[PDB]
Symmetry: C5
Subunit: 310 residues, 5 copies
């Protein structure tokens, strides 16, 4: 039983994020728990303040015609309990629900440990015989407590795209809004726990430049290469199969190289030190002790710049 | 209260994928969230446009007779909220729901990291005393937004098998349709993270051809063999118990060999270098330095061709 | 409001497996999704074909008296949607539902990787003041599509025990039926991934029979023993705490031995080669190179026979 | 509408375990699926056998006043379907439901692999204006089929504490009963898979007493220490964070010691054999070959006795 | 149909924790199962004790006006069954439900293994045309049995913030309460299983100060570094991505250092003992045998103090 309008009925929206949590990098989802604030003029039930009752008259959902406001990017049906419905004199309705649903917004892992994200919530609404345009009411969109959690992420701002995008979808126009949750990552636990430990093993790796014992040079370069796999695998697990290249995926892989040429050197410092030409060997070994850390720190400036600086 | 027909009542179907996600290779399932569009002539409620009401008349599901359209390959009951029902003059009904259910479609891991898949959604419908044939309406089957996600997979096309397959199941004919979601994998994160690291350790493995120290040769070939298990196990975990052989399961196992004969060589380069016959030893060792990488790259062309090229 | 009988009312059952999946070895359960077909004479609503209506008259569950058919070995309440109810003239009722519930049937892991299983579904029914006997109608028990999945298992046959087992349970006789799902395992992925890799490490283990370097013999026998734990642990995890002995649990453990006496030998080949008695040492070492693989392959014939052959 | 009594109305209880399963040591819970048998005199609906109807009259739950019998230690609401209600002449009611709920009973891991447990189910009932005392009827408490499963546990007995415990909880007396499920563990798969493998590695550990090569002694004692972690971690995972000490937690940790002093010895057998005092070294090494296994087997009798014997 | 008041209607709250469990450090949540006790004066249904019925009159929820009391920090809708409603003469209502919901309270891992926590449950309530203030009734808040479980945590006290916090949220004041669950961890299983084993490997690490064999010194310091990753990874897994530094994350990382300079020393004890200057080498090595354990135990006092002592 929809509201007999004279033009496209505007529905007024708003989201008050109450709780954020379980942002799942692998799955590219996250769970939210918020208020949904809707409103519209249904002149059809305006109501003579003086003549009867009081200021505003409370209805149960069955009584009034309510607009179906579906969330677009949601795993299952949104999970909402209705909080209050308050029809104004002029026929204006004040709806408030408190849904919670896991939302499917994508993430850009291009700078992985040091990335910022922009999550989305959508809200479509389909037309019947009056057209429905949705739009935001910013006093119910200040939505975000001063307690919005979302572990391991700094929450920058909850805003929304005022202008809706109105489609024609299957011979019936819909109207979609864009609610934006912007967050930077709390990179850090990534250093004492990944970045640093990863570097340390790389350095030990090439302690075998000041060494001549092949036995203790392979026991050297090789033992550490293993440990680095232990970190490549640790990192690769809390992170999805990107079709592009991560930052840490870069350096973690560039690392795989300074373990090859490292093992190349120690290997050649020997089919060159049994070839009774230690003239050359400890020439190269002497040299690696510079080329390596330099070319590294150099390619890390080259690499890092290639990602952040551009 | 079914629609008094004169022949098999055609029901017209359609699916607009709104969201795709949680494709689970182990479980061989995936979750979808779409529109379901149905329609049929129930002349029994045609309705004199002029004589009353308006262009089209809205019903609640309880009022009209609606066809039970069950999804075949679904874990639990599909999870659908009804979006609109609009009966036309002639008695034509326009139904639209927005279900979300995890679907059980199988996958072919024969090319694992480089595989393409064809997921299915089914839709049966059982007959009563008028027969029901289902069939697709392609304006509600263009189903797939321009945002269909499905992480780590490229989505190629959402189509469907126009011709239904009508069974006789328990003295009552059913009619089933086939909705096809075709996707290729985003192989890649499989290289910097599996393929390459896996290769590197294999190479270092057989650096012990330019070496004579047994101690540093087993410390050599053996250390890396371990690391390779660390990758065989990593890979074997995000992948189900196929009764056939995966591609990466092949090469990952062919790899287990070039670690055995590698260990064979270093082992014989010694019961042959203590047998005061280093004549022979550093003949073999010298040789392995070719046989190995060749036979490998050879068996990789042999292997790769055996999977992709045929 | 039960059917006024003259003797024990027979209820006629039937299950059409539509989907099988999530067989969980650890949990000893599995999920099924099937049809449930029931039928009985309730003469009390026989209905004068000519005098009124038509051939068969459709009821909603609230209208008719229906027998409670509970599933015995089920985790929670069975999860069923009712598909059709069709009362015949004589008063015969035709009921059909489409339940899905995870079933708790036990498994016998005595031959683990090479085992066949017989899963059960039960169906009791309690009496009131007429006795209820259940029994099977085999045209609705041909239940099993030609698509019954159940990953990593070959499905041999869906049958059922015609004769019911009628208990007296708490001063009211019940009647239980036995629906049997027989499946063999797809042992195989167990070879390239467990059996073979497990053997290979055992072999390398005792390459240290053709060796004299204690350093590279412990680096030898010992490194492999580790790797075998890596497999004992892998296997032990996808498998419950049996009070009996698995097959692979046997050989996996018999393996632990050929790594002890292996380590025993290498160890004695030395407190006997420093005891300036290499007379004896390279007598034993020479010998082990036979005793071991023989006694193994011998005890594997002895073991294998002990499980399968008996 | 409760039963007008003259004193505390006795409600008669009973539980027929139909199915047991998913005992979860980590979570300290388990799932059961049983019958619940209740009964009480509601003289208020006694009913003139001859004057009307028959021997006993069947009611739907809505018709009669039924006592709320909540289970105390249950995760969520118990999940029950009602099986039959049969009011006797005198006004006696016969109630039977078939619930299934996961129960939260605690476990005592003090003897871990060799422990026996006593699981509980509770049943309270709150009073209104007549007091409710619950009590057991032992013909509906013989509850336990001859098929009660519960994998990896031997089921010893299903009994119950006849005398209820009546509390005063919030100005209204409740009455609670105690249903006892006693089970011993099927320790065993713990030997071929944990105990034995764990010992074997410990023994090889100290094969390095009959050795002099430091390289092969660290490669010896150390390699095995790792493997033992692989077991400590395996065990620690299928077992919760006890505030007390497990049995296997003891020996698994006492083991950590015989790997330290083991490594201590091999280490000192060398800063004492390079100190040109091999006089002493192979005095100690000689000695360890006894002290160790003895002190172990000694501390294992000391330890084992400390747990089981007391 | 709300209670015609003369001022802000006070609603009187109370929570009796019946069960605690599944505290999930990763997810920062936990499940509770408690009583919820509400009460308020609805003079509108006061009821002439003598004139009719009895002392107190029982209602079903549909009959009375009940306040919506939503829990704030909850994943999904709270899961509550209603236990009793008892309206007093004066019009006072006595409500009791038994909900169970997983709650989202944050945790402070700054002292990880030795941390104490303060979990929250919230309860808001929105106003309509009479204002709603909530407040606690402490005889129904003594909520916590003498069996409150919560594995691996010592439960210190269940209390609540008497004074509510009244917001203005979207043109309608709400009122929120704070129920506090305080718990210390059962650190301990963290010692025999993490702390101690972690230390032991560190010590063995630097046994290679009383050694001169580079081969057995890298086989020494390096083997253990690996094992330490095995612990860093074990610990890092049962713990979320803190933006701050854990205690065990500190020492676990400070440990990474005493493995670097350890490896630095053994490495320099050699490009200095081949440089025919063993004058210096076994000067340094001699020294490390003190500097290390001291600087450690020193930096552990420095570190530990930095977390607990401040
Ligand atoms: As090693």
């Amino acid at each position: 039983p929809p509201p007999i309008a004279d033009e496209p009925l505007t529905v007024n929206t708003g989201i008050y994020l109450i709780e954020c949590y379980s942002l799942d990098d692998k799955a590219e989802t996250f769970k939210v728990n918020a208020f949904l604030s809707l409103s519209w003029k249904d002149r059809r039930l305006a109501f003579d303040p003086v003549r009867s009752g009081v200021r505003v008259k409370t209805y149960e959902p069955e009584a009034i015609w309510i607009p179906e406001i579906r969330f677009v990017n949601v795993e299952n049906a949104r999970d909402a309990d209705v909080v209050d419905i308050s029809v104004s004199p002029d026929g204006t309705v004040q709806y408030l629900e408190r849904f919670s649903a896991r939302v499917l917004s994508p993430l850009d892992f291009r700078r992985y440990p040091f990335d910022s994200q922009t999550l989305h919530i959508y809200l479509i609404v389909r037309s019947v015989d009056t057209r429905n345009i949705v739009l935001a009411v910013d006093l119910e969109k200040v939505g975000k407590n001063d307690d919005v959690f979302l572990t391991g992420w700094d929450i920058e701002s909850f805003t929304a795209v005022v202008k809706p995008a109105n489609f024609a979808l299957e011979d019936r126009l819909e109207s979609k809004l864009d609610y934006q949750l912007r967050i930077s990552r709390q990179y850090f636990s990534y250093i004492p726990n990944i970045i640093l430990p990863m570097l340390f093993i790389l350095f030990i790796s090439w302690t075998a430049f000041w060494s001549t014992s092949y036995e203790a040079n392979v026991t050297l370069v090789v033992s550490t290469l293993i440990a680095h796999i232990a970190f490549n695998i640790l990192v690769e697990t809390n992170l999805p199969k990107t079709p592009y290249m991560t930052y840490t995926g870069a350096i973690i892989f560039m690392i795989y190289l300074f373990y090859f040429v490292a093992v190349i050197e120690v290997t050649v410092q020997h089919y060159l030190k049994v070839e009774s030409q230690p003239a050359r060997a400890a020439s190269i070994t002497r040299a690696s002790r510079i080329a390596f850390p330099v070319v590294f720190l150099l390619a890390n400036i080259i690499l890092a710049f290639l990602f952040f600086g551009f």
